[PDB]
Structure formats: C-alpha cells, structure tokens
Design a protein around this ligand. Sequence first.
Ligand SMILES: [Zn+2]
Length: 27
Amino acid sequence: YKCFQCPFTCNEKSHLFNHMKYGLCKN
Ligand SMILES: [Zn+2]
C-alpha cells in the first residue's frame, strides 16, 4: 500500500494498518 507518514509501502493495506498501528511512523 502507500503511507505518507513515512516513505513506506507494502503488499496490502493489512500491513499499512499494522505499520500505522505498530507505531513505526505516526502522523
Ligand atoms: Zn508511514
């Protein structure tokens, strides 16, 4: 997916959520 919080992308949203919820990059 796509993440503006920090240059990050993944195979699917489920990972974006995890990436957003993991606190790796908060906005
Ligand atoms: Zn991000």
